[model samples]
Target: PKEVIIHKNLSDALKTPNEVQILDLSRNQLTILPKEIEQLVNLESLHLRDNELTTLPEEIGILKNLKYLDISRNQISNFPKEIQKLKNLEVLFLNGNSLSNLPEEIGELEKLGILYLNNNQLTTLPKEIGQLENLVSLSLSSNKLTSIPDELGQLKKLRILNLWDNPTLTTPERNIRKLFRNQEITIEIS
Candidate 1:
């Protein structure tokens, strides 16, 4: 249960602790992570916020035990397609990143319950996102999206959806009401 802390000041060649379950390296100046990080297959949570990282290693998908990942506040422009391989992931935080699009494979994460994509440059989401049958909450505020795919209607489990800060995006007014049959899908607009 011990925590492993890796900072920007730490040597890049340092290895990730094999038994570490939590790793926090936020607010670091790191631009890239060592590929050897895949050795920590037991990692359950990883915090990599406020870094200069432009991309994540495709090897990151090897963390089969990862359940929570916070990669907000980074310079990443895209996510690896392999990220969807983390079938156990439940919560993902990508707010405040430079990402403009999410991979279609994102729908593969059937266990994802909460997703935060607010404050990104995304203009559209993959229609496949509707496949997230277990998704309960999604925050997509502050983006350039123009419309919500009718496919979102498929998410019967979605409870709260935030679209407040996005001025140009439109969720079909009438269809929105009919989508979930009054199941209480909250839509906020600024």
Candidate 2:
């Protein structure tokens, strides 16, 4: 764990990380994030994995410059609604967590290309997911899912979909097979 994990509020550290672009706070024992993080207006990459955090402050949305975010391996059960405001986000990682559902507004991230939701507790995907026409790859392996919305086929740019090892998933085999058929998409069912 060579990464410096900021433990105290960096609110007053007028050092101006505002011009900063990346922050990694993984493997920390943090249960909550400092609300002052919004000051990093230019932050584009943030990693907060393997923490004890259960929720993210809504202020997280203020980072209009964020493009890459990895908050995996936490205790989070709910996703912040403000996340949909990250229109510039291209990659999002939510692996190894406790999320059971997504905010319907998630589709608002029109520029998102890669989304990972592996090893979670999701039972169904939001229909809004179909709105992500720019999606290139999506991973939803090892969840509690039993079905996927037919709208999933709307992802014309989707090239890879990992639906492996979900014993509960019951997306009608034929329809899914057809969706990937003749498309460049590779759907893994392992």
Candidate 3:
């Protein structure tokens, strides 16, 4: 295979950063990530699940070509403000983290397709969330949100809306059903 598949060593990957595309460092007990990650100019996929990361470096946003990022099951309490710089980001997995809120800059990713934020500590959503016109599947179950913004209705391409276990949020199934009746979208709430 011609593709570079780095498992855990960032130093080795940096030896030829431009040629490296896929970096999988899942379940490695990583507590802090180095800032040199920004050197990877062509990174497309980054996997960092089941680690101890409480946050990510701001330089992560430098990956202009990143398409897939999986950071689930980590201890992260917040996403870096620089995440909005990834213009080509398509899929983001943040399930089981400690995130309590999303940056307004999150709306900058015009190409995001699938976003998983289940099992976090989120209590409010930014209205800019609606700006993700390309979003398809949005999983926001098991959070602490008391209400949702009406702007979510703007997601014309959304196919799945998971809001299970938010005891305080008023279920808007009827409105959602009517809004996406022609798309066969699935809406789950509790």
Per-candidate Cα lDDT values, in order, are 0.81, 0.83, 0.87
| Model 1, residue 82: C-alpha shift (Å) | 1.3
Give me the displacement of residue 179 in model 2, in angstroms. 2.9
Please give the lDDT score at residue 168 for candidate 1: 76
Off by over 4 Å in 3: 1-7, 175-184
Q: lDDT by residue for model 1 over 1-190, one digit each (tens)?
A: 5555543322332354565677777887779866766777787888888989888999899988889889999988877888888999999998998878888988999899999999988888889999999999989999888877777888888998887688776656576657768676776656
Q: Which model scores highest in lDDT?
A: 3
Error of 2 at 38 (Å): 0.5
Query: Looking at model 2, which ten-residue stretch has the lowest summed lDDT?
Result: 1-10
In candidate 3, residue 62 scores what lDDT? 95
RMSD of 1: 2.5
Cα displacement (angstroms), candidate 2, residue 183, comes to 2.2
Candidate 1's TM-score reads 0.89
lDDT of 2 by residue, 1-190 (tens): 2225432224433376664667777876889977878888887778898989888899999988789888899977886889888889999998998889877877888899999999999998899999998999999999998888888888999999998988887666677878657779788885
How many pairs of residues in model 1 come into backbone collision? 0
lDDT of 3: 0.87
On a 0 to 1 TM-score scale, where does candidate 2 land against the true structure? 0.90
lDDT of 1 at 138: 89
